[PDB]
């Protein structure tokens, strides 16, 4: 499993959009699916 | 014809209002009309 990420979390705040409120906008961006299909086995409980 | 203007291009980026966007607001200002009415003649195609 290969996770790709950017290791910092961008933070913004704005009295400018809503006037009496502050509205903290924080976001980080991150993603990943499997790189190697032979390296993960699963336990199915059915059969 | 006399053109009056400011020689720049004011850029204001706005992460705040359109929140997942950046929203560059750029505005220069310019005006102008004819200064010497004798120095422009026209070709009318009618009559």
């Amino acid at each position: 499993y290969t996770i790709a990420e950017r290791p910092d979390l961008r933070v913004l705040r704005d009295p400018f959009s809503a006037k009496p409120h502050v509205l903290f906008y924080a976001s980080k961006r991150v993603g990943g699916d499997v790189s190697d299909f032979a390296a993960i086995k699963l336990l199915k409980f059915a059969a």
Side-chain angles (χ1 to χ4, degrees), chain A:
Chain A
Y1 196 76
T2 294
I3 300 168
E5 70 179 3
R6 189 186 292 268
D8 51 355
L9 192 150
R10 65 178 69 92
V11 179
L12 184 66
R13 65 186 291 270
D14 51 350
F16 314 103
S17 176
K19 300 292 194 297
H21 303 285
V22 175
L23 192 62
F24 293 91
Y25 171 72
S27 70
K28 73 188 291 292
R29 57 186 301 162
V30 64
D33 59 355
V34 291
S35 172
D36 194 1
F37 291 85
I40 299 167
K41 299 295 179 181
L42 276 71
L43 190 63
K44 191 175 180 181
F45 282 91

